[PDB]
Amino acid sequence: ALTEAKHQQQFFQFRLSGQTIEVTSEYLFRHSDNELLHWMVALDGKPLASGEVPLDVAPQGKQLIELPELPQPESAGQLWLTVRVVQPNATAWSEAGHISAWQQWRLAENLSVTLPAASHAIPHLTTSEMDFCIELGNKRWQFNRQSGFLSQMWIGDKKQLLTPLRDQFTRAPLDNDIGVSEATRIDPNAWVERWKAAGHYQAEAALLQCTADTLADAVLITTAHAWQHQGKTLFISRKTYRIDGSGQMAITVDVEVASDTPHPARIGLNCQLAQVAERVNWLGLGPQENYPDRLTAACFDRWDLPLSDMYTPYVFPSENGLRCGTRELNYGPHQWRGDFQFNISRYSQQQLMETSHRHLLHAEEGTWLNIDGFHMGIGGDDSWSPSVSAEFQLSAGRYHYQLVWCQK
Amino acid sequence: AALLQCTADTLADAVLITTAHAWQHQGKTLFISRKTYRIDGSGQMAITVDVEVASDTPHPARIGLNCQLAQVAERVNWLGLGPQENYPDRLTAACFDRWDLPLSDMYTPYVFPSENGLRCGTRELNYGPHQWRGDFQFNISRYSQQQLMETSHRHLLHAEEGTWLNIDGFHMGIGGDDSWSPSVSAEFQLSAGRYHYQLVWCQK
């Protein structure tokens, strides 16, 4: 959280107007003499321009900066402008080259019109009575017909799932989700308290429908679950899986949330990756952990970091290391695409929920992946009463998300 | 528009139509509308829509479908907000109920024609033998969005051949803080980039 702070607290404010940039100094007594403003442009992570420019802004002053005529590529993707204020020389409290601030804007968007190149190959579907199997080349996908889940997937001979791919609406309760609710003295207004008390944590799925159809070019998996607790339907999960000639899977999801139930901490899926890699690369906001009511200090970019770094050692273990507005992320041979939020560590949430201390958790067989279509804000105004803004609560009822799962 | 794709597939008990269109002005793709019509043996089609909106285009006034039917029925009946014309940034005085009105009450006689009579939060619409179902905003008159727009006075409007129908998954705000500058507040602007909505059309 130290970052959302530094950033919000910065001394230089920015306004971009066209290719022009307005800088505002919040300094009251000092002129900017140890400032340099770098700036850069870049299609989905790829640089196309850099530029340094020395700030000469007085305290309370404004300063103008005209961006040299930008570049423009046809290439799909989003254009992003990012800036930073740099302290060329070292001071007493800062190293030389210290970043004192930054801001970033999205310049443009060239959408992708192009359609794919009509599968050379095709998915084959095996209709066991227990499963629906799908194959195409070295790749195979197992949909269990009784759980409605996607129990297992192979790349060649190797399995990839230790667990299945399933809907998730919960979260190992952060400090603020708990507040002062105790075991003796329960706080019925605690987010967790209300969640706890509604069966969020113990809802149980219910196959309502599981089908396969073969499409002129792909395999269609339809499924629908209802999660309930005491004859009470809390949620409804409606998906479709689409495996096509490129051995690419398209996940489309659509959840219904019963008005009269506390709002979910989240909405998405999770599974245990059989695998374990060293690095994590994604295209979104980062590098650091970031939540919805807490991501203004984060930058959209191509980030590359170590597994160790995607987990936040909060002495009192709780949900963490989330990264928002992710468009893509690669882990091992996997690659996921769409818009979402994710978290990837070596710990089930349960392990998180059930551990009082960080030093008591242990890494698990594979890799726990949490993909969120959506996720509730964290809160924080106080950690003794709900301090989560309504905007950051998943109150829609109706929710939709889609994924593309594939390999390399 | 631009047809990127259009495919009929056959299923166990349904039919699957599948489209992609791209809206462009001068080689900028404004929008993209992806869809699947899925007709079934009950004689009922389920439309799904998934639009993409470019981040650098002024946000759409709205996002939906429309068409002009032939039927021209006396009433209208829906389960949603009303009975009166409600827009998103103005819908508090409305109530969720089962409303049944004359078509006429479906048009609002503003003197300087403009979009009107919208009803938000509709769960079920009904006109003639058709019924539509889901989560939408809608409006229905005998005037085209375009007729309204090229007519300076309500008095010069003329009824069109049948009922025009506007079914919106999404509609921008109305504003009002003032009329000489932009009044729509952000939460009312359609600026998310991705929109998804569903419908179900059927008859009786």
Side-chain angles (χ1 to χ4, degrees):
Chain A
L2 192 51
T3 302
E4 185 91 338
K6 177 146 108 167
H7 180 221
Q8 286 298 324
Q9 313 194 317
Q10 63 217 26
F11 296 102
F12 302 99
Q13 290 306 325
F14 312 98
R15 302 208 28 272
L16 146 135
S17 197
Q19 86 172 352
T20 281
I21 282 140
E22 192 196 276
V23 150
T24 305
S25 172
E26 307 197 309
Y27 268 129
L28 304 166
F29 304 112
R30 87 150 209 127
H31 187 94
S32 54
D33 55 47
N34 196 22
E35 262 80 17
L36 246 103
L37 129 74
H38 295 3
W39 61 256
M40 127 147 359
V41 186
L43 210 16
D44 300 337
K46 354 111 215 173
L48 333 174
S50 279
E52 307 149 27
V53 189
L55 304 166
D56 200 24
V57 218
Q60 323 279 255
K62 286 202 199 247
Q63 156 153 74
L64 297 183
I65 293 176
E66 229 218 13
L67 279 193
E69 184 234 309
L70 313 164
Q72 3 225 267
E74 323 269 48
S75 349
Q78 239 162 348
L79 192 74
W80 277 98
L81 166 57
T82 294
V83 318
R84 305 162 195 301
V85 159
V86 182
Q87 278 173 20
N89 308 108
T91 70
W93 50 274
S94 62
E95 275 297 60
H98 173 71
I99 297 171
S100 68
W102 73 91
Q103 192 58 61
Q104 143 219 87
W105 305 264
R106 158 174 60 286
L107 297 157
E109 197 181 15
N110 261 297
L111 312 174
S112 194
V113 212
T114 100
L115 358 67
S119 342
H120 308 171
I122 124 120
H124 192 209
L125 166 76
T126 301
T127 321
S128 148
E129 65 78 56
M130 207 30 149
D131 310 291
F132 272 144
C133 291
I134 294 67
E135 45 324 58
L136 156 150
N138 55 323
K139 304 160 187 197
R140 192 180 358 115
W141 293 268
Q142 211 208 312
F143 287 89
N144 171 322
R145 297 190 70 200
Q146 1 108 23
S147 83
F149 308 128
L150 156 100
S151 10
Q152 179 73 244
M153 110 132 291
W154 303 244
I155 251 49
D157 25 0
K158 341 114 214 183
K159 284 121 62 285
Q160 310 282 322
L161 304 193
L162 313 190
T163 340
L165 195 41
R166 23 131 120 106
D167 284 294
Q168 180 162 242
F169 309 102
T170 70
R171 90 184 182 186
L174 341 148
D175 274 350
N176 320 316
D177 308 306
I178 287 129
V180 325
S181 180
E182 262 105 20
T184 352
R185 242 187 279 86
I186 231 71
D187 183 10
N189 273 300
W191 266 114
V192 60
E193 248 354 300
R194 335 219 290 277
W195 285 323
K196 243 175 81 193
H200 277 202
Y201 283 108
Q202 52 236 229
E204 314 192 320
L207 196 21
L208 296 169
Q209 136 185 199
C210 188
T211 78
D213 272 299
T214 261
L215 283 321
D217 78 285
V219 202
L220 197 46
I221 309 333
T222 268
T223 50
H225 302 44
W227 280 247
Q228 351 176 75
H229 187 256
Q230 357 253 245
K232 169 103 190 179
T233 357
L234 312 206
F235 320 122
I236 305 197
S237 221
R238 280 200 202 101
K239 21 200 166 349
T240 70
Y241 312 65
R242 187 220 218 234
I243 314 251
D244 80 346
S246 34
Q248 210 203 60
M249 80 155 344
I251 322 219
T252 252
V253 194
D254 269 277
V255 167
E256 274 199 290
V257 212
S259 131
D260 59 353
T261 210
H263 313 325
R266 88 164 81 217
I267 293 164
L269 0 107
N270 89 330
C271 77
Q272 181 161 196
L273 289 209
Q275 289 58 66
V276 188
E278 188 185 278
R279 284 250 166 191
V280 180
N281 168 306
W282 71 107
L283 177 67
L285 286 230
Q288 315 217 98
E289 150 201 288
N290 63 98
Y291 294 69
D293 46 357
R294 199 209 59 217
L295 45 63
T296 70
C299 295
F300 180 83
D301 209 310
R302 182 122 252 139
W303 308 104
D304 188 280
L305 282 171
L307 193 47
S308 332
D309 315 353
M310 315 305 267
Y311 148 85
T312 307
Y314 287 122
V315 181
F316 166 96
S318 82
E319 141 86 49
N320 72 111
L322 188 101
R323 333 248 152 164
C324 295
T326 274
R327 318 271 357 253
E328 159 190 320
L329 129 114
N330 308 307
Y331 187 63
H334 309 94
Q335 140 168 149
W336 308 264
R337 304 192 308 288
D339 189 334
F340 56 77
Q341 346 291 328
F342 79 92
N343 95 53
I344 183 162
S345 46
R346 310 276 325 255
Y347 306 102
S348 52
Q349 286 259 288
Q350 252 213 158
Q351 206 206 153
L352 284 187
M353 210 178 158
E354 300 148 3
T355 311
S356 25
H357 314 41
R358 62 177 192 180
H359 79 303
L360 293 189
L361 303 162
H362 50 270
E364 327 188 5
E365 251 170 313
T367 307
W368 277 115
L369 181 79
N370 281 297
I371 292 233
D372 282 333
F374 324 86
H375 193 271
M376 116 174 186
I378 65 193
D381 295 351
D382 74 36
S383 329
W384 55 85
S385 66
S387 45
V388 165
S389 27
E391 330 112 67
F392 290 137
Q393 289 184 10
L394 341 177
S395 55
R398 256 88 57 213
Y399 282 115
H400 170 98
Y401 71 106
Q402 83 161 82
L403 264 213
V404 152
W405 196 338
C406 80
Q407 293 59 31
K408 301 150 328 218
Chain B
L3 208 312
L4 323 146
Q5 124 173 208
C6 176
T7 82
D9 285 303
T10 307
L11 287 15
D13 51 341
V15 170
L16 221 98
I17 304 314
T18 293
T19 79
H21 304 68
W23 276 263
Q24 19 202 354
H25 185 247
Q26 344 271 237
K28 196 351 195 299
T29 292
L30 282 171
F31 325 114
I32 285 131
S33 160
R34 340 182 110 112
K35 277 187 242 111
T36 81
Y37 317 51
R38 158 153 204 313
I39 313 220
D40 95 335
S42 329
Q44 131 186 154
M45 39 158 353
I47 314 130
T48 264
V49 191
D50 279 89
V51 178
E52 225 159 338
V53 177
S55 116
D56 54 8
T57 213
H59 329 323
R62 76 154 100 226
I63 285 186
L65 317 153
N66 108 309
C67 73
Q68 149 182 217
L69 318 144
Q71 291 68 50
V72 160
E74 192 187 282
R75 319 237 110 219
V76 179
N77 165 309
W78 72 109
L79 181 79
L81 333 156
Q84 66 210 266
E85 141 188 327
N86 56 85
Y87 287 74
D89 47 358
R90 216 192 53 227
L91 42 74
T92 80
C95 303
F96 189 69
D97 223 68
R98 176 132 266 140
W99 312 123
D100 185 302
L101 299 173
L103 178 61
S104 23
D105 295 3
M106 321 279 348
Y107 161 63
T108 302
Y110 290 112
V111 181
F112 160 110
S114 93
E115 148 80 35
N116 69 80
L118 200 96
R119 339 254 138 147
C120 315
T122 309
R123 265 190 141 123
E124 162 171 306
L125 163 41
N126 302 294
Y127 186 78
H130 299 102
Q131 134 174 127
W132 299 251
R133 305 198 319 278
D135 207 319
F136 52 103
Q137 316 349 323
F138 80 93
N139 79 36
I140 173 175
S141 80
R142 314 264 312 268
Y143 302 112
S144 73
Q145 272 300 296
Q146 196 237 217
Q147 201 216 157
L148 283 175
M149 167 177 192
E150 32 116 278
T151 307
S152 51
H153 291 74
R154 64 212 221 96
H155 83 269
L156 309 158
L157 287 182
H158 78 295
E160 301 188 38
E161 241 176 302
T163 315
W164 267 112
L165 172 63
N166 288 311
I167 302 217
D168 301 329
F170 320 77
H171 219 271
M172 185 184 137
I174 60 129
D177 291 26
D178 79 72
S179 324
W180 44 98
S181 83
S183 313
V184 197
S185 332
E187 345 85 80
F188 291 143
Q189 299 181 28
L190 309 189
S191 62
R194 276 82 69 185
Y195 294 88
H196 164 100
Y197 70 97
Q198 340 157 154
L199 260 226
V200 155
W201 183 349
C202 37
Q203 300 71 17
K204 327 157 326 250

